[PDB]
């Protein structure tokens, strides 16, 4: 099966972890979601405590981003850790997909919407009610 | 002069903004500073209305990524730009440093943390009234 790398802020609010179950839940009809391979608490989900160490929440991230056919993001809350992740796909050339929801009252970063070209990384604007319809459109 | 790329949150707070104003100044002493070629407004930090083009934003910031013998980071407020310089920066196998402040509250992005490897990838941890020291003891 097609391999796909979902990330989302490890700190999102209430909204952003019902949007990015509904994001995964989408993406399984489409492929393995190999960033659900292992417990969000493992990735920091619920702090530090719960989770695995840094470099090996780092070094688990790099190799399913290398494994991934398609990286998807949803990029509402600012993130050091989504961004970074969006940085290293863009260098191994993957085919991305940002989701980002102006209705947050938030301003996309312009490094995010800048790496932009219409075709290997696309960043589409969305309301929360048509999501799964949006990754129908995309993977289909 | 050797060329220093520094990057830090388009929306930094004041003290972030304090913070990146002495940052930039004590680099100076050690090469030339990139990032300030260009105002900070058409870089975003004034808002949408005063910035460039988001393309040109990012483009502009990958030729400077690219020119760079150092990155510098200031990681302490989350940012989706910062990620992504950062990600860029580690697979164009730049010399990096994070500065990060703990007595902000907040708890380092894992995927910023564990890309550290105490050479080419430095995460330091500092306190206000010490940033300048720590760059001399990094640029020595
Ligand atoms: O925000 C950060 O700085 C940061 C730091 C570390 C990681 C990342 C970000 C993202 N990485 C990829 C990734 N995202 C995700 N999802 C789904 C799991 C989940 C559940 C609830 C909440 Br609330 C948040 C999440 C996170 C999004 N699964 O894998 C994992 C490691
Ligand atoms: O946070 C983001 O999503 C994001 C989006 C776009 C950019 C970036 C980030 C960062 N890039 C590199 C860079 N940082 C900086 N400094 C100094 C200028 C400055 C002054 C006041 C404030 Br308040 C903030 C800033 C920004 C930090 N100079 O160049 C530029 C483009």
């Known amino acids: 099966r097609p391999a796909l790398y979902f990330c989302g802020s490890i700190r999102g609010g209430r909204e952003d972890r019902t949007l990015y179950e509904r994001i995964v839940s989408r993406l399984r009809r489409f492929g393995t979601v190999l960033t659900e391979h292992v417990a969000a608490?493992?990735?920091?989900?619920?702090?530090?405590?719960?989770?695995?160490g840094d470099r090996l929440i780092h070094e688990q991230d790099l190799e399913w981003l290398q494994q991934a056919d398609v990286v998807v993001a949803e990029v509402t809350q600012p993130s050091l850790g989504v961004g970074y992740?969006?940085?290293?796909?863009?260098?191994?050339?993957?085919?991305?997909?940002?989701?980002?929801?102006?209705?947050?009252?938030?301003?996309?970063?312009?490094?995010?919407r800048g790496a932009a070209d219409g075709s290997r990384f696309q960043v589409w604007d969305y309301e929360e009610g048509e999501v799964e319809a949006l990754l129908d459109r995309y993977f289909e």
């Not at 608490?41 to 695995?52: Q, T, V």
């Open 41 to 52: 608490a493992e990735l920091g989900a619920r702090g530090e405590e719960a989770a695995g």
């Open 85 to 112: 992740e969006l940085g290293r796909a863009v260098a191994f050339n993957k085919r991305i997909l940002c989701l980002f929801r102006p209705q947050s009252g938030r301003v996309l970063s312009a490094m995010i």
